[PDB]
């Protein structure tokens, strides 16, 4: 359907948006900062497609403590105006917090197809976590994964990717882009299934020849995304540690971050 009227400040082909910063891949894909997206304009886009995000987190033994935090930020600063759905996987389903919801969001708990018939996309990401400031639909898109915050700066040479070859993360020193979190990608239903499918196949493999990789999921996740290319990347925005790192002037803002 077509955009509405709408004013706002036109686009200056003659002034880059960040001057600090790569904000599009080798492979065309936009990298996430501030001052990238009017999200007006895309608010509007993903409304119109009336769309639904899918939220994930696991929630097992002691970090289940971490839920209540994580709910009520969310509330506050993800996908606000749209479609949720979040989807707690917990080993104790009655220590799960009653958080007051907003209208067109809800919650499932579930104990340890659908997602399909439920969501458009999905979010994955780790419970012991906060949201400090807005984290939208300028994310969405078929496969997106997360720049590392402590990775981004450095060569691909340092990057704590799998290094042993008889790994199916393996990577060698001449290969990488960059280093992608485990505890932030999404994207369509379809390839984020795509994705685990192909990162519990190489672990399988793994297990059976007596190898398990360096940073676990994460190193799959690298390899992943390494030969399918994410049609976005966030940011360290999207994933930082305040206490750790610090609050450097290359980022604008700080999104969704470590609980100490
Ligand atoms: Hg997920
Ligand atoms: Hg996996
Ligand atoms: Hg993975």
Redesign the pocket.
């Known amino acids: 359907v077509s955009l509405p009227r709408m004013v706002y400040p036109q686009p200056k082909v003659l002034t880059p948006c960040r001057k600090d910063v790569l904000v599009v891949t080798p492979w065309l894909a936009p990298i996430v900062w501030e001052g990238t997206f009017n999200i007006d304009i895309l608010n509007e886009q993903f409304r119109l497609q009336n769309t639904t995000i899918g939220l994930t987190v696991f929630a097992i033994k002691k970090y289940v403590a971490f839920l209540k935090l994580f709910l009520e930020t969310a509330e506050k600063h993800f996908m606000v105006g749209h479609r949720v759905h979040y989807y707690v996987f917990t080993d104790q389903p009655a220590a799960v917090p009653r958080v007051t919801l907003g209208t067109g969001r809800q919650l499932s708990v579930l104990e340890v197809r659908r997602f399909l018939s439920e969501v458009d996309y999905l979010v994955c990401v780790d419970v012991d976590m906060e949201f400090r400031d807005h984290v939208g639909v300028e994310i969405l898109t078929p496969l997106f994964g997360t720049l590392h915050p402590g990775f981004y700066g450095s060569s691909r040479e340092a990057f704590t990717y799998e290094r042993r070859p008889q790994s199916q993360a393996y990577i060698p020193k001449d290969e990488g882009d960059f280093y992608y979190l485990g505890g932030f990608f999404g994207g369509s239903v379809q390839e984020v299934q795509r994705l685990?499918r192909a990162?519990?196949q190489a672990?399988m493999v793994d297990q059976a020849n007596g190898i398990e990789a360096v940073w676990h999921?994460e190193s799959?996740l690298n390899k992943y995304l390494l030969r399918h290319k994410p049609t976005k990347v966030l940011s360290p925005e999207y994933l930082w540690d305040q206490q750790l790192l610090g609050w450097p002037a290359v980022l604008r803002k700080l999104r969704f971050t470590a609980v100490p």
């Open positions: 685990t990162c519990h672990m999921d799959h």
